[PDB]
Design a protein around this nucleic acid. Sequence first.
RNA 1: GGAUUUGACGG
Length: 534
Amino acid sequence: IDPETSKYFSEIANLFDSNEVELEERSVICGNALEETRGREYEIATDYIISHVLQTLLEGCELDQLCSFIRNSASVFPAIAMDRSGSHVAESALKSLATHLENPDAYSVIEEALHSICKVIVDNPLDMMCNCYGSHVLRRLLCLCKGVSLDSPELYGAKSSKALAKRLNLPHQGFPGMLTYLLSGLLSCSREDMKYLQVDQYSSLVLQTALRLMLKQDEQLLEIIPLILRCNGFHIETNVAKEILESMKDNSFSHLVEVILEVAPESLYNEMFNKVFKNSLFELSVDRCANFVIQALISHARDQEQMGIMWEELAPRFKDLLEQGKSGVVASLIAVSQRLQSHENKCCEALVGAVCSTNESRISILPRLLFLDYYFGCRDKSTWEWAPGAKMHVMGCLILQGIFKFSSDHIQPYITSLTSMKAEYITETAKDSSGARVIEAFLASDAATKQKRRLIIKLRGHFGELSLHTSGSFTVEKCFDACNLTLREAIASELLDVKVDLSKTKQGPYLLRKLDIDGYASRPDQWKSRQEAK
RNA sequence: GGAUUUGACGG
């Protein structure tokens, strides 16, 4: 790269840093500058400085010039995509294409640009799939072929609370033929090559994204999943099942199998359950990686016979699982009993017995689950009662949120334990961003109204402080909604005392309006008669 | 306007 080329692209960049140029002129300049990359796309896109300018040009230009750049760079696209800088240039080209998805006039021009890219990739895909940078480019490209532009953490595939909520039970048409063509190229390697794509972090990530994009496309899922699992009616022979089972503790493969189980059609799921997982459930649940596969398996069980097999292998070991930091397995099994309507009472009672070994300790089931890690990690479990000031346990509180969705017939120990907690522990729970969710789930349960009222009364004197919390303010709302006139007035009176500070907060204005705190202060008789009418 | 599992990811 000569200094004339450097100066040219740097001067373009400075020209955009100044806003002397209007939007229409800018996109024309972006297109002219792309022409200066012809015949040296690789050198410019992989330059550690100019790559950034090229990103700006690709996202600022119009569709025709973008497609011309993609067409002219296609023969070097894999090398660009596998470069530490060039990969961001490649992804900027994809993001820029994605901005035209909503334009129906753009369909065939986009499809042709995707074809030129997919064809060079399919010709030689395996090192790109395993490449730290190339794997990102491929994920984005797969998403674009599906027609999704909006980056989703889950698609790429990070954790998200939405995926946890889905696991715990709490669109543009795209270019379907291009997605199928690209993915089939990624999968047409030998069974032995596939065995190592399974355990390579970057190819596993590519295949995870592809499987998520194929959700509900059962005829494609039934073709692609047997290729990934090397077991090409869907049947897993005994020796292949052994190899799948033996790789389940690998960090890369375990993430892949989580996604397989999430998208698997019924027949394919049932075969994996029977041939791979059955009789190994507890061993896999104690492994630092495979236990997340078991969580996915549990969450997607299909019928009551499977629920019975899962309960027999795992419920006797609820205590072990909680002791060893595997509470998500327990949470998944409890949640799916609720969905499959099977073993509900057995799951709730097994959880109590796992946490409370003696009859007398059962009154403490709520505190111990709220602080699950402190209780199981403490020096002397016979004297532990609380963890003053500590942040409550996320998965323990999610378990409790699921508990309070059962029929009250199944969870009497939990209702009694929660409503028995003394005022200071209940207020501490309400002030916790996880504990507040437990209280709200109880308030929404079919526990008796007198039991709800008993708990709400023990929050009296603290509604003002709670309203100032971002999380606690929702709890004030839901207490208020569940109250009679007398307690609504008490809550309204407490918010009145902190009305100045409360209006400063993000939630304050909405809380003050929903409870009509101004009307209570100014016309209390009219406020009460409107409240008593609700 | 709200916490988000115990095991991965970039010039």
